[PDB]
Amino acid sequence: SSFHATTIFAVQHKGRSAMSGDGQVTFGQAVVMKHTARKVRKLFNGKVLAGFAGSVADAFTLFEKFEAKLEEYNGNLKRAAVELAKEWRSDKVLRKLEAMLIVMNQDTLLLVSGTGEVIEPDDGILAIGSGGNYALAAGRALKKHAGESMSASEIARAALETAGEICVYTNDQIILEELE
Amino acid sequence: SSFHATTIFAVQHKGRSAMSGDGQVTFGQAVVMKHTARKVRKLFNGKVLAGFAGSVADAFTLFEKFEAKLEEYNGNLKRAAVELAKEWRSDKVLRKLEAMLIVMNQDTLLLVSGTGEVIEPDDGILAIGSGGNYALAAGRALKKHAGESMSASEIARAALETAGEICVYTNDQIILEELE
Amino acid sequence: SSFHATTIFAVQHKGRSAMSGDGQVTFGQAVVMKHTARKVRKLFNGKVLAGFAGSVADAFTLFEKFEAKLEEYNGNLKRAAVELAKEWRSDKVLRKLEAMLIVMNQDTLLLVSGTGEVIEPDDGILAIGSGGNYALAAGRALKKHAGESMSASEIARAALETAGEICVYTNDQIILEELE
Amino acid sequence: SSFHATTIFAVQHKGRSAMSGDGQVTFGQAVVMKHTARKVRKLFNGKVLAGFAGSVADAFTLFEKFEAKLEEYNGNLKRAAVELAKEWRSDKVLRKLEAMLIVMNQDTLLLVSGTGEVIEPDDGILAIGSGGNYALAAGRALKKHAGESMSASEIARAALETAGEICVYTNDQIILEELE
Amino acid sequence: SSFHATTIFAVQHKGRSAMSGDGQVTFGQAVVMKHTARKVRKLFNGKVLAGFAGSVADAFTLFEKFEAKLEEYNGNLKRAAVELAKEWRSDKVLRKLEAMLIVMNQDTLLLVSGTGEVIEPDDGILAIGSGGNYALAAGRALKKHAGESMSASEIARAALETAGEICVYTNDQIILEELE
Amino acid sequence: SSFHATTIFAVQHKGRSAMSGDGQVTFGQAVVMKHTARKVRKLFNGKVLAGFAGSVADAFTLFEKFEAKLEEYNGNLKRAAVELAKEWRSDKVLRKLEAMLIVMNQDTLLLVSGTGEVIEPDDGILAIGSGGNYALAAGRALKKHAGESMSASEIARAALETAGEICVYTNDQIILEELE
Amino acid sequence: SSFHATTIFAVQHKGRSAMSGDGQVTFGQAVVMKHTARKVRKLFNGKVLAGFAGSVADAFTLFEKFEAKLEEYNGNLKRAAVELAKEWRSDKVLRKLEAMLIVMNQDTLLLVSGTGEVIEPDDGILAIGSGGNYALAAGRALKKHAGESMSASEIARAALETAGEICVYTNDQIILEELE
Amino acid sequence: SSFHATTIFAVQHKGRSAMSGDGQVTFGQAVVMKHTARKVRKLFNGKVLAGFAGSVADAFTLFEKFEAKLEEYNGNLKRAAVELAKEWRSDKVLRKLEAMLIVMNQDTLLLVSGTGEVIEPDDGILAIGSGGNYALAAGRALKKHAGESMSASEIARAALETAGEICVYTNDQIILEELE
Amino acid sequence: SSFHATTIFAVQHKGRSAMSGDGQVTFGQAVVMKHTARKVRKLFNGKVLAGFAGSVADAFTLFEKFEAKLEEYNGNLKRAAVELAKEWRSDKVLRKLEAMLIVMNQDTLLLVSGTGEVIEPDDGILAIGSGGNYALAAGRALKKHAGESMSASEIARAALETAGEICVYTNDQIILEELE
Amino acid sequence: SSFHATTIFAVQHKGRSAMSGDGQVTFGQAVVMKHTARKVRKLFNGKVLAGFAGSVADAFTLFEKFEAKLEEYNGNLKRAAVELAKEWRSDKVLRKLEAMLIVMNQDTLLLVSGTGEVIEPDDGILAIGSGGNYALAAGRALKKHAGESMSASEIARAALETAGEICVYTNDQIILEELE
Amino acid sequence: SSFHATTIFAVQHKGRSAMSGDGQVTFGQAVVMKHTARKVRKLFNGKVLAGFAGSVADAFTLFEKFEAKLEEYNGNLKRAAVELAKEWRSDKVLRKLEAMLIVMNQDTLLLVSGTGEVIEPDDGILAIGSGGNYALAAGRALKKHAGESMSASEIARAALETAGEICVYTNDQIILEELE
Ligand code: NA
Ligand code: NA
Ligand code: NA
Ligand code: NA
Ligand code: NA
Ligand code: NA
Ligand code: NA
Ligand code: NA
Ligand code: NA
Ligand code: NA
Ligand code: NA
């Protein structure tokens, strides 16, 4: 695709879960078409945060499917994720997607891919999209050297701000959701 | 090279001259290193405006060769430009440069390239650099359909503003210079 | 070349200056030959810090050329750098080096490059090399949201630590130098 | 994919079997998302060791298929492995996987690939994945020249350590399983 | 070129210094033209061991050049090595060589490259050439995990045996030099 | 070069010589910087028409040189052309130019190139530039099937109009010179 | 394929319709196999003219599909074409053909393509194939500046004659068909 | 494929029909695997000569297919040839063949291709394969300029001799079929 | 695939039939995984020798398809080979294999490829695989110039030895099968 | 360059010498600018025939150099030709020319190239340029099989005609020179 | 260059020295221009045999440079070869030649390349050129397995014959020189 993924960051910190994302939709090398896209949402009656950085048709397809697996498996995030991955990597159309998916609940944080990966981080942080690695670095750092004086939302928010500031493909229209 | 040119816009409008530029310095595909670069300057005793979007050492090599060409052909901008163009494109190293130069005095506005082009626009507008074509589109549009209500500086600033809003390689730290 | 550049991070914070770097020397895609390289040094009687991530033969040529420039412009970092850049971009050989130089005295921080760039950052941080952008994201973030409880050297070290943890070309063998 | 395979090593030495593997999950050129993956498992009631460096949806599809072949051919490692190969290679999707499979019981050791290869080594060692070749050379050297003073598990862990030290894609978070 | 570098390994271990090398000279992808090439020599009245895996016309130009720098700087391996590198990286012809040089005296081991690298290993071992990395993994594995019962020349030899056994560009015709 | 040549057409018809050219200066694939460039001129006291489609620095260099050969050889177009070609193809800088030169006088029409060609057409028509082949086809046709009711200027003019109408790289700001 | 398309030109002028084409069949870069191919035909009882420059097997499939479409929409050229285009762009095989179709009845001229284009020209001329754009330039020109002394068939023939004379892939073996 | 087509020539001349072919089968760039291949056969009770220069599995599939179309359309070379082409170009596998088919009966000569070409030559001669063009030039030269003293089979043979003598992919093991 | 083919050589000499192959299984460019592979086997009850260097799952698909064709065609080797070729070349996956097949009985020796080639040699020798062309050159040379003093099995053995000596992809662990 | 070489043919037959050449000057893929070039000339007072398909500035530099060698070595065609080659190939500019030179006197016939080749044919014929290979095959066929009924000049003209008929880059405007 | 190297083979066997080469000069991919070229010569007064398949102007530059080194080093072949190599590899043009040199006297046989290689074989055989690797495999095979019954000159002759039989670039017009 000529559209660049947006940037999504997620973190669990002191009993709190947050997921932040910017809104920049770039087409081609350089042209911004939208500034405020919303690529982070709540699923399963506000019990789960989901972030998909690709197109909305692919986001909805994956959200619906993940919702159905969550019902079929009684809220078990890990199982629903593994089964989604299995389906995703065998689907002729969706498998080729570059954009990844982050799902999280109260207990755990997961990265799902179209090549069929399901990855649980070791420090409660995942990041994806064009800016994802910069936000990853900024959050990891904030949580380790400033964890005590910052929360999960202040962290998700700062990580994305740092990334907007260095990534040309990430902007400063930050959307932030938390689980309570 | 891995450093992107900043964006420069120039306009002659109703007797006034102005030049503007953003400050975004990007290295590689996506990484911003500086936000407030200055690449628009006054030369030749505040009588010309010059804009060069490439590196500093090339800026000084070119600006010095330009000064010398002016104090050689009696302040004639067209002739000094042409002769700088002749020497630029025959220099083993400098002629490979992608970055172009804009010089302007009270009377005329010129683009100079290291392949030896000297171009004087038909509509009082030149633009170069990563966003230069978006600034060119914005400024031409304002000058033709809203020129009666905007000054040369208003257009200069407004063109850069549009360019920054749509081009990932151009930001909102605008620097503007005017003659007189 | 096949040899990757090590990673170097520089920061001015609260009147203090620091510069860290790792020691991983990687050859080709994936083969580490050395873990404890020293690519950060003091110059001009311990008044400036210099980091160059390229080869030793190029580090010596550039550290000696900059030494000449410093004594020839009496300690003035900016004028030395600009003259270094002009020399570096004119040199048939050294002009092609991808690796860059960071120089800093107690007043200011500069990046110099073989293409002839000289860049002073806006927020007192520079970083270069393989893991540079991760270290730059980690450092910018800690300064904004944890500046009031971390010093220049603590930030330098944590930004290199963050970078080594996410970047395969950056290790944990950190060298840190400061000015008083 | 963009995800790099982890490193897996297997060895039969003096009647003992052992398999080691690291935890590094690298995405794209240089970015580590996970440090502690588990890609080495036990199957068939602790009679076989299986290593698969790939994604988990793929690793489960293969561990399931192989288990089904092992019970159909009554624990015969080679018969199950050959029939796995046939099926793997005639699968429109999984056939394309770069990630290979190592399987072993108390009697032998076999690499299996989506191209349909089934290879038994001549010297009791296989290794695969990003760092596989470095593990192989370490492992083989130790077996041949230090084999009276190291056991299978000692060698397995040492070959992976050696590989972790020289390969940027292999870390030091070593998981080791043996056949009791 | 179309000719592949042979393989060379060096190690310092319990006061002893050894350097081993194979003899396989391969032309193009796959044709072996010689099997007993000698690319390991003693220089400086049997006090230094030098190894260069590229062509003879280059290996002599470098050995002569290196030996002059030694007579000029009175046995100082490090100094001569750096001056070699300086000269080498500014030479129009020799700067482009892929093949690298290893020099070692009783006290130290050094890799020199035509891009101007001078690298002392942390662990007493260097290896270069087609099979260099395999020999590096082997020798490192031997020294760490079977160092108390193996000598420097015994390791040099073994690391090359392993390299030859797994790498198609490395044969079993080994040459071995040591310093007492 | 990123600049596209403009389009030039030339014709001798019933004792008349004309040369027409459009004014579109395109940079990159698609961006028009100027509409009215003048790339056809008179040399040698209005006795010769010259058309060069490249940059002005190259146009002037070539016009001056051609002027000097014309004086050195007493107006002989063919000889001055051949000597220019010889000089042009040996000059390290100019030889690589893509744009060609058309010169004509009362008696004859010539195409000169940087690879050293001098070509006299068979039907008194030459064309060059982005649109040149379309203008060539349009003129050839006009002169053969409508020669009697159209002159050299009406032909040069129509050929360029046809070409503006089908070539995206040629526009309708036509400049036309004739010899009397 | 290696086989080049012949050249076809179509024109409505003064109530008259004509369609010409050459017969050069070129294989590969430069080898002519045939000089007198017939790629222009009459259909639907001599009321329409069809030119297709591709292979005979594709000419028959498309001339028969268009025949079906014509009887199924009662002579209406535009509705037949649009339905042909939809069918052609859906077909797994024929959809990739570079060659295009020109159809014309006494009312109108259309171009149809495998990508599903249907284009009616603005000035009553179409052309396709190897020499198509030269024939299009020659024809457009003769109609504008010699329309009042040339008929539709005379223009068709002169445009193909002009094209053959400048295009290496177009010969002089012209076939012309008209409607009364 | 890696296998090169052999060479085949056909000619009709003074009521006689001949087809000649070499036997060289080359694999990759340069390795000859057979010298006496027979790719010229008689079909349809010795009434047609067919030649196909690709592989045997393809040459039989086409000869069978062609011979069925002949029994179905009662000896009509042209009709069967067109239906062959229609079928061939819609076949998922055979459509991709580079190699072409020549069929000729007493009255006519035809080239059929898998892109659906059916071409009758103007001058009684076809040639295909590696050396086809050289044989085509030779045979054409013989027929025109030495036709009154050479027979059809004498030309087929000579055109192949010449082809073999100048083309590395064509040898001198000639097979010759004729119809009375 | 990243697995190179072993080398296989067959010969019929003085009424004896022989086929040899080495055992080297190389992965990627240079890494040897196995040294004693068996790619030469006896089929159809000790009556045919078959060689296939690819993977064992393709070996068995092909060795089953081939038995099934021998029964269909009453042991007629050439017919079965031709029908194997037809089905191999139309198989969507197998069609793409680089590895070729050699089959042989008492009377004849064929090479079969998945592009549908079936080649019987003219001098009683075929060879395939990595080192095939070396083994071919050796055997043709021994057979022609030392034929009167070697047996079929001696030549097959000496050809593979020669190939292993020059080809980095061929080794010295030779398997030999004969037919009475 | 973008300009294609013209076709030149030379032949010695029964004591007569003759050289033919066409006139087509093609630029880029397909565009003919000239139909009647003259690239075949007489030198040295009508004792030698020279053909050079290239540009005229180059063809004159070579005809001049060769004439100077012919008078230095007293008409010795081979001595002059070899010394021409040496000089041609050591010329920083002309050495790169694809266009080759044919020269002949009453005794022999020689191709000379900027790579330094000097080739004498075995059968009295050379040909060069775009259509050279087709002329060669035509020429050779006629000489060998029709040589008692055609002279050198008859063959020369016939080989070029044949070449003009099959090659899109060669026309029928044949210039012929012979040694009286 | 578009001219392929002839094939050259040298051998020392039982105190006799021999060198053979074919005569095929091929231009581009496939066109044979000469069949009897002489690339094997006797030098230094009948004492050394020299083989070089490239052009005669390079042949003579090299054969002069080599004489000049033999005098300098008192007929010591290996020394002259080594000094030739050094100067060849630093020559800006000759450095780039693909053709290699074989020189040989009564005592020794060397291969020299313009990348500075000098190789003395271990089994008395070298070969270079298009068919070199085939000639090498043949000769190694005749020497080792039929050595006791062939002379040096017989092997050289039989090796080139074998190579010509399999390699499309090698022919059967063999030149043989010996030293007593
Ligand atoms: Na940004
Ligand atoms: Na922006
Ligand atoms: Na790391
Ligand atoms: Na590591
Ligand atoms: Na080996
Ligand atoms: Na236009
Ligand atoms: Na033409
Ligand atoms: Na041949
Ligand atoms: Na080998
Ligand atoms: Na032609
Ligand atoms: Na041959």
DSSP codes, H103-137: EE-SS-EEEE-TTS-EE--SSSEEEEETTHHHHHH
Positions of chain breaks in chain I, given as the residue before each break (C to N > 2.5 Å): none
Q: Which tokens in the block code for residue F158? A: 């129509």
User: What backbone phi and psi angles, to 5 degrees, belong to I37?
Assistant: -60, 150
What are the helix and strand counts (H, E) for chain K? Answer: 4, 11
CATH architecture observed for domain G1-180: 4-Layer Sandwich (3.60)
Nearest to F33 by CA among F44, F22, F41, F25: F25
Q: Determine if residue K170 is labeled as part of a ligand binding site.
A: yes
Instruction: Give me the total of CB pairs closer than 8 Å, taking one residue from chain B and one from chain C.
Output: 47
Q: Is D24 in a helix, a strand, or coil? A: coil
Q: Domain residues of chain K, as ranges?
A: 1-180
| Residue to substitute from K115, K125, K136, K140, interface E, most E β-carbons within 10 A | K115
Whether A164 has a binding-site annotation, put simply, is yes
Strands K7-13 and K16-21: antiparallel
Interface residue G31 vs chain H (CB under 8 A) = yes
* Residues facing H19 on adjacent strands: H10, H177
Rounded Cα gap, residues G93 and C147, in angstroms: 65
Nearest partner of K155 among K180, K138, K132, judged by Cα: K138
Q: Per the CB < 8 Å rule, is J82 touching K56?
A: yes
Which runs of consecutive H residues, i.e. helices, occur in chain I?
A: 56-72, 77-90, 132-146, 152-166
Alpha carbon of F91: minimum distance to chain G alpha carbons (Å): 31
Describe chain H by its helix, strand, coil percentages, rounded to 5.
35, 30, 35
CA of F95 to the centre of ligand 7 (A): 29
* Beta partners for residue K41, in sequence order: K50
CB D11 within 8 A of CB D152: yes
Contact J43, J177 (CB under 8 A): no
Q: What region, left, alpha or beta, does residue I116 occupy, with left being phi > 0 and alpha being psi -120 to 50 degrees? A: left
B45 in helix, strand or coil?
Answer: helix
Q: Vertex A113, ends A108 and A118: CA angle to 5°?
A: 40
Is E2 within 8 Å of chain I by CB?
Answer: no
User: How many CB pairs (< 8 A) connect H and I?
Assistant: 51
Helix locations, I12-131, DSSP H:
56-72, 77-90
Question: Tokens representing G150?
Answer: 């040339």
Residue E1 falls in the annotated catalytic set = yes
Residues sharing a CB contact under 8 Å with residue C109, sequence separation 6 or more, in sequence order = C10, C11, C12, C17, C102, C103, C120, C121, C124, C125, C126
- Is there a contact between H21 and H38 (Cβ–Cβ < 8 Å)? yes
State the Cα–Cα distance between residues A78 and C116, nearest whole angstrom.
52
Per the document, the length of chain F is 180
Phi-psi bin for F75: left (phi > 0), alpha (psi -120 to 50), beta? left
Q: Do residue C142 and residue A140 have CB atoms under 8 angstroms apart? A: no
Asked if B137 has any chain A CB less than 8 Å from its own CB, the reply is no
Q: Which of H120, H80, H113, H76 is nearest to H98 (CA)?
A: H113
Alpha carbons K156 and K139: distance in angstroms, whole number: 7
What spacing in Å lies between the alpha carbon of G164 and ligand 10's midpoint? 10
Answer whether D30's CB lies under 8 Å from D2's CB: no
Collapsing DSSP to helix, strand or coil, H85 comes out as helix
Alpha carbons H44 and H73: distance in angstroms, whole number? 12
Q: Which of E25, E27, E60 to mutate to test the interface with K (most CBs of K within 10 A)?
A: E27
Query: By CA distance, what is I155's nearest residue in K?
Result: K145
- Give the pairing type, strands E16-21 and E175-179: antiparallel
Q: How far apart are CA F126 and CA F148, in angstroms?
A: 20
Given CB atoms, is I160 within the 8 Å cutoff of chain K? no
Residue K147 burial class via C-beta count within 10 angstroms: exposed 0-12, middle 13-18, buried 19 and up = middle
Residues in chain C, how many?
180
Strands J16-21 and J8-13: antiparallel
Closest CA to I130 of I54, I73, I69, I76: I54
Count contacts between A and D (CB, < 8 Å).
Answer: 50
Q: What Å resolution does this PDB entry report?
A: 2.5
Which residues does chain I have within 8 Å of residue E165's beta carbon, measured at their own beta carbons? 32
CA-nearest of G163, G140, G179, G180 to G19 is G179
Cβ within 8 Å, pair J86-K3:
no
Distance from CA of C28 to the nearest CA of E (A): 11
Q: Does J163 touch chain K (CB under 8 A)?
A: no
Ion ligand 5 residue ranges (Cβ < 5 Å): E 164
What residues does C3 pair with on adjacent strands?
A: C27
Sheet holding D118-119, edge to edge: D40-43, D48-52, D101-104, D109-112, D118-119
C162 within 8 A of A140, measured Cβ to Cβ = yes
Angle of helix C152-166 versus helix A132-145 axis, rounded to 10: 130
Q: How many CB atoms lie within 10 A of CB A84?
A: 24
Query: Residue D14's Cα: distance from chain center in Å?
Result: 19
- Say if H and E touch: at least 3 Cβ pairs within 8 Å: no
**Hey, what's the torsion of the CAs at C137, C139, C140, C145, to 10 degrees?**
120
DSSP chain J: --BPPPPEEEEEETTEEEEEE---EEETTTEEEES----EEEETTTTEEEEE-S-HHHHHHHHHHHHHHHHHTTT-HHHHHHHHHHHHHT-TTGGG----EEEE-SS-EEEE-TTS-EE--SSSEEEESTTHHHHHHHHHHHHHHHTTS--HHHHHHHHHHHHHHHBTT--S--EEEE--
Minimal Cβ distance to H165: which of J140, J159, J165:
J140
Residue B95 to residue J137: CA distance in whole angstroms = 48
Chain-chain contact of F85 with J56 (C-beta, under 8 angstroms): yes
Instruction: Give the Cα separation of D114 and D76 in Å (integer).
Output: 20
Residue F138 sits at the vertex; the CA angle it makes with F135 and F139, to the nearest 5 degrees, is 85
Q: Is H137 on the interface with J (CB under 8 A)?
A: yes
Q: Is-contact J104 J121, C-beta < 8 A?
A: no
Q: Are C148 and C165 in contact (CB under 8 A)?
A: no
Beta-bridged to residue K110, according to DSSP, are: K103
Determine, for residues J31 and G167 on separate chains, whether the beta-carbon distance falls below 8 Å.
yes
Are I146 and K145 inside 8 Å of each other by CB?
yes
Q: What is the I170 CA–ligand 5 centroid distance (Å)?
A: 9
Per CB-CB distance under 8 Å, the chain K contacts of I165 are: 140
Q: Give start and end residues of each alpha helix (H) in D7-107.
A: 56-72, 77-89
Place of tokens 């020179």: J177
- Closest by CA position to A10, among listed A173, A98, A119, A171: A119
Name H162's Cβ contacts closer than 8 Å, sequence gap at least 6.
H134, H135, H138, J137, J140, J141, J144
Closest to F78 in 3D by CA, of F68, F67, F87, F70 = F70
Residue appearing with tokens 């690939």? D113
User: Could you give the CA distance from residue B26 to residue D152 in angstroms, rounded to a whole number?
Assistant: 52
Phi, psi (deg, nearest 5) at residue A91: -65, 125
Token pair listed for J148: 């008692």
Q: Cβ of F179: how many Cβ atoms within 10 Å?
A: 18
H61: annotated binding-site residue? Answer: no
Distance CA J2, CA F99 (A): 11
User: Would you give the distance in Å from CA C147 to the centre of its chain?
Assistant: 21
d(CA K87, CA K69): 10
H helical segments located in chain G: 56-72, 77-90, 132-146, 152-166
E56 at K interface, C-beta within 8 A: yes
Give the distance from residue E5's alpha carbon to the nearest chain K alpha carbon, in angstroms.
Answer: 11
- Label residue G75 left, alpha or beta by phi (over 0 means left) and psi (-120 to 50 means alpha): left
CB-nearest to C58 from E116, E126, E133 is E116
- Are F18 and F10 in contact by the 8 Å Cβ rule? The answer is yes
Q: Read off the amino acid at residue J167.
A: C
Encoding tokens for residue G110? Answer: 């259309």
Return the C-alpha torsion angle A53, A57, A62, A67, nearest 10. Answer: 120
Chains K and G touch, using 3 or more CB pairs below 8 Å: no
Which helix (H) or strand (E) covers residue K58, if one does? helix K56-72
Torsion sign (Cα): J148, J154, J159, J165: negative
Task: Answer whether J touches H (≥3 Cβ pairs < 8 Å).
Answer: yes
Q: What is the SS3 assignment for chain F?
A: CCECCCEEEEEEECCEEEEEECCCEEECCCEEEECCCCCEEEECCCCEEEEECCCHHHHHHHHHHHHHHHHHCCCCHHHHHHHHHHHHHHCCCHHHCCCCEEEECCCCEEEECCCCCEECCCCCEEEEECCHHHHHHHHHHHHHHCHHHCCHHHHHHHHHHHHHHHCCCCCCCCEEEEEC
Please tell me which chains touch D, using 3 or more CB pairs under 8 Å as the contact test: A, C, E, I
Instruction: Provide the experimental method for this PDB entry.
Output: X-ray
Q: Which residues of chain D neighbour C130 with C-beta distances below 8 Å?
A: 30
The closest CB to that of C1, out of E85, E115, E122, belongs to E115
Angle, CA of K87, K92 and K97, to the nearest 5° = 80
CA distance linking residue A109 with residue C120, whole number of Å: 39
Neighbours of H64 (CB within 10 A): 11
Q: Please give the Cα distance from B157 to B155 (Å, whole number).
A: 5
Q: Are strands H25-27 and H16-21 parallel, antiparallel or unpaired?
A: unpaired
User: Bridge-partner residues for I119, per DSSP?
Assistant: I111
F44: left (phi over 0), alpha (psi -120 to 50) or beta: left
